[PDB]
């Protein structure tokens, strides 16, 4: 008949949560506050990322109920933290600044975009003070009531200049699973985001995941295959976000074409602050180029795919975002060390019916960045010396709906968000952790009872 | 057949009935190697301790169901059919381990108790009986 | 009889001679689950490592006194009476484990050595002898 | 003969063939006992976890080469001579373990695989065959 | 003890309070059934800006 | 206070300062440890 049997080694898993540790490659050298990013304490990857495709398997995933994104998000916060524990605490900066304009080109093609501020400051000696001066981007200075100004995050947060040894260059991170667990990767080129993925594989641990911080635009991400997938748990809901993932890396060239000078001010003892000494070179405006042709064609591919969720009898409109906080209004990202806020009006400005040249994006440069919408904390990037030229793909999109009022053909979508955990779900959607239970009870003609 | 880690997941239970060791090996990962607080350091150690803890829980379970000669334990006592009674072909010609656990998920804690109590106690004290002559 | 954890503490040794497993199960506590420094965090982990360390010390001792088929190990060699010589009724009709350990507390390290050396070495190399024909 | 920990290092392999346990005991050091961050504290714990991790790796290896009745495992299948073929006297009358490992250091990962696969799989499913009559 | 500690690591360190306080009585009920039991103290104090100070009470 | 002229530096009575100041922070050891070296035994884990 059928009787009870015990096995050990039964390839069976459960959906579970557990902790996942980093796995990297040995390239830990940079020049802004510690290391490369945090990743030099990492265990070196196996030179053979062994995988195995699992025949016949069918497991439902839920890229919207996955937990790995949560661990990842907390850990990235904390690593940013640890990189910011040990370097200088810039509290005595929050001082009344005497600022004037920087007379940029007559009449105005930089509109200043930076003010020239002198101020009092402590010295090496807790004694007779010094008068220094520095150039600040008028986007991070605020008025009161020359005129007296101050740092923006000061009456709300403390600030913590990153010293010059870490990078911000994202380095491929490999989330690795401790023994007794397993990482499942959906091998299906065509996957909505959830539900049963038929073609799956197991890996000991994942691919390199460039942990780029970006808004409205997935940079350096992975690319989709044979289509440009759309992912969201409830498209019919207007309160989620649409995750578009391209086939073709649409280039973007961003640059800051200034030779900027690093002026060191000793907030003694021993602590030193890097201010913007001056700017030399072609004073253009920081910006980004994109091939209009490829963007238009690929966004038409997107038109097709958005249609496939709304009917071949519709008209879709891409508008720019509807205003608000800076960190959501723009394509914010990090690049060569600096922090870019690109206005994207020039990219969602078109309604679309049922059926070189290049686009220039004018971006501004911020300093006192408040990362992860967290308040009470504030990193202060240092003026990166030299000229910045930085090239990248844009592989995906993060859109928000406002329609379902007179909802027939004309839908309007605008970009936005502000939670990186979207960015993170865009590359872990194929991944799921399972706990292994190598203990098994099953019936065969081995026999025991109650 | 060299399937690999979980390689017989998409196979009938009798198929996986030969590739048991492959999962067992992965219960330490060897070289793993996985310095102050060091985020990912606490993670490394908490991982390893979790792994051995996990391992030892089930190895303990097997210690209790005293076999230690694992992958197969068999006695001569019949089995209770009440728990989702099914056919032989309904298992080996109709089911893989995955689908099987979905159905057996209820009776686990039950089974654990009697496999623990019954054979251990019966096989106990009989060795005590035969330690006389 | 289902006494429970230490349930046979107030019983003669032959009584507890049936409820051995109940203590063994508590050697992991399962779900225990027991975040920065987090006082009670270091405590949690230091606890778990202490537990498995404790477990493995004695499991090692049993590995050495090679049985692994625990709760009973028996051979055919006599026993030394010098160590607090007492009667059978003085043990099973007069003593519980608690009172017993108080009296045996002296000879432990002695006993450990010969159970380790003698049978291991004798049972060794005889398997080496019978590996010929 | 009571050599001690590694006491038979300067001896032919057949000599050390009797003092195996002495190293095994030192795999926990007992009392070790080895409070905030406390340099040497992290060291203490990282040490202990390393120790048990080390122990469990090889105990796992032995679990796989399923003996658990350690110090000797023997079957009836011949052995491959290709791997640094040498004489009996070239080993027991000419070599100590130290010199031996220098020569065998190449074939280790090879040997691990077949001792793992071959006997485990063959001795498997034959118990499954004799679980019928 | 240590838990009290950990709860007290991360919140504000009030060192710049230790400043000369200008205190008067709080005229509680005439004549006295609170005897004050509290004084009214004004003092100098730093500000958001490590600059021109403020007078609080 | 009286300072050993080996750890004070000039500028340009005359005004002087601590030496490691324009380069490092300083951290007075309080009065409970020693510096008396005590035999340390490096011990090896099992
Ligand atoms: C999406 O992903 C893509 C890749 O997939 C990313 O693209 C990366 O973008 C970054 C940002 O620019 C590039 O890194 C930086 O490139 C700088 C430009 O130098 C390059 O061009 C010059 C002139 O042609 C060459 O001479 C350079 O080659 C030499 O230098 C590099 C780096 O030192 C060496 O590796 C080579 O062997 C050559 O020796 C480059 O090809 C470059 O200045 C910069 O190097 C600084 O930064 C790194 C890390 O930040 C430091 O480790 C390094 O030591 C340098 O920093 C010190 O030196 C400068 C010298 O002046 C000082 O000023 C600094 O203060 C500091 O002391 C870095 O190489 C990167 O190359 C590029 N990827 C690839 C594959 O090319 C995108 O960034 C990413 N998306 C986003 C949004 O970022
Ligand atoms: C960001 O910025 C980078 C660098 O500025 C851009 O990368 C350049 O992209 C362009 C566009 O394709 C490349 O230009 C083309 O290169 C082809 C291959 O290069 C060979 O030929 C050139 C001569 O043109 C040689 O110098 C070189 O060594 C190679 O042997 C050429 O075949 C192309 O020429 C053809 O098209 C042009 C029309 O433009 C005709 O006039 C020609 O006669 C010919 O038919 C063209 O030159 C360029 O090579 C890339 N840079 C580099 C260093 O190679 C990114 O495109 C830019 N991204 C954005 C979004 O702006
Ligand atoms: C810090 O920098 C500020 C400017 O950035 C300096 O502020 C100046 O302070 C002096 C006093 O030291 C002010 O002089 C005053 O002028 C009034 C009217 O003339 C007079 O009645 C006072 O007796 C006093 O002399 C001066 O106006 C003021 N200037 C500004 C623009 O605010 C300050 O001196 C700097 N401190 C140090 C230590 O460097
Ligand atoms: C995804 O979000 C949409 C909303 O955009 C959800 O649809 C909404 O579902 C609720 C109930 O589930 C509907 O409430 C009631 O619906 C009935 C029938 O439509 C209606 O007669 C009632 O008056 C009441 O409105 C709601 O209308 C509906 N809205 C839309 C726009 O469809 C949908 O359920 C979400 N997805 C999932 C899987 O739940
Ligand atoms: C920001 O504004 C300040 C003024 O508040 C600028 O500082 C002053 O800039 C002038 C020229 O731009 C320097 O002039 C020099 O003065 C010396 C002595 O009077 C003279 O011998 C030289 O021939 C030359 O005329 C002046 O030194 C400088 N003052 C300080 C304290 O630096 C500053 O240049 C502005 N920032 C930028 C980036 O332009
Ligand atoms: C992002 O970039 C867009 C353009 O790509 C900026 O929108 C532009 O804003 C200006 C000022 O609001 C608009 O000018 C308007 O012109 C009319 C006609 O002369 C005048 O009557 C209005 O009073 C206003 O001055 C301009 O049309 C508009 N461009 C587009 C394409 O709509 C936008 O301000 C930028 N936002 C950020 C946050 O960078
Ligand atoms: C996205 O594109 C739209 C359309 O170009 C921009 O909206 C426009 O924004 C301008 C100001 O930036 C609005 O001008 C208005 O002027 C009146 C009169 O001075 C003022 O009282 C209002 O407060 C407002 O500033 C304009 O009405 C508005 N038009 C529309 C149709 O939205 C928007 O600024 C762009 N945003 C980005 C981030 O590109
Ligand atoms: C901090 O608060 C204290 C009181 O809580 C203030 O103390 C006052 O300080 C002023 C000087 O700024 C003293 O004025 C002095 O008066 C003498 C005699 O009239 C005169 O010879 C001096 O030249 C000077 O003008 C005043 O007496 C003193 N009052 C008390 C009660 O101590 C202090 O001003 C506050 N500081 C700040 C920055 O708010
Ligand atoms: C998820 O993928 C499925 C198909 O793989 C999409 O449609 C499903 O269609 C079946 C009918 O064959 C329904 O029973 C399912 O309920 C549908 N899925 C969902 C999630 O509702 C589906 O559109 C995809 N999900 C999204 C959000 O696009
Ligand atoms: C897309 O447009 C077509 C025709 O304009 C509609 O008709 C479908 O066409 C597809 C071809 O890709 C067929 O596979 C379907 O069977 C057709 N169905 C019907 C009902 O005609 C189609 O409905 C449109 N799709 C949407 C989502 O509106
Ligand atoms: C965005 O789309 C509009 C409409 O297609 C383009 O046309 C501009 O519309 C504004 C509206 O007031 C006019 O003021 C401009 O004069 C129009 N443009 C021109 C060249 O005349 C507009 O050009 C598009 N801009 C971008 C950046 O996409
Ligand atoms: C965008 O992603 C593409 C992925 O194709 C990157 O393309 C790589 O380009 C190098 C040199 O051109 C090739 O050696 C690689 O093989 C390409 N990748 C692949 C997967 O084939 C491209 O580098 C990315 N964009 C930028 C700016 O780096
Ligand atoms: C086989 O299993 C069934 C149920 O799966 C057992 O039935 C139990 O019988 C006892 C004694 O009357 C009741 O107290 C329980 O309530 C019954 N179980 C359930 C789920 O109601 C049956 O006893 C088992 N076989 C043997 C021989 O004990
Ligand atoms: C039984 O135990 C007794 C003591 O408990 C052993 O007596 C030992 O004999 C050796 C050999 O003469 C002496 O060196 C020891 O000093 C004795 N022990 C004590 C405590 O003094 C006796 O040898 C044991 N039985 C056997 C057969 O060895
Ligand atoms: C004994 O070992 C030798 C080598 O040490 C084995 O020779 C292998 O034979 C296979 C089958 O032809 C080849 O693929 C390998 O390349 C050989 N090994 C080497 C190192 O070249 C031999 O097979 C072993 N004995 C048996 C019975 O398999
Ligand atoms: C303020 O409170 C004190 C608290 O006792 C009052 O104390 C006075 O102390 C002086 C000592 O120099 C005595 O001479 C007075 O008789 C005390 N007063 C009383 C009411 O006992 C003091 O009077 C209070 N001052 C005011 C203005 O209320
Ligand atoms: C993009 O191309 C389509 C046709 O391929 C055209 O209808 C549309 O106008 C183009 N975009 C713009 C902004 O002109
Ligand atoms: C297991 O128990 C759940 C609890 O409701 C029940 O829904 C399911 O049908 C049960 N399955 C079997 C095979 O007993």
PDB file of C-alpha atoms in Angstrom, chain F residues 29-38:
ATOM      1  CA  UNK F  29      43.672  59.499  29.327  1.00  0.00           C
ATOM      2  CA  UNK F  30      41.763  59.620  32.592  1.00  0.00           C
ATOM      3  CA  UNK F  31      43.320  58.098  35.726  1.00  0.00           C
ATOM      4  CA  UNK F  32      42.344  54.356  35.926  1.00  0.00           C
ATOM      5  CA  UNK F  33      44.292  52.221  33.347  1.00  0.00           C
ATOM      6  CA  UNK F  34      48.015  51.676  33.534  1.00  0.00           C
ATOM      7  CA  UNK F  35      50.611  51.502  30.937  1.00  0.00           C
ATOM      8  CA  UNK F  36      52.416  48.797  32.847  1.00  0.00           C
ATOM      9  CA  UNK F  37      52.570  45.983  30.306  1.00  0.00           C
ATOM     10  CA  UNK F  38      50.885  42.874  31.656  1.00  0.00           C
TER      11      UNK F  38
END
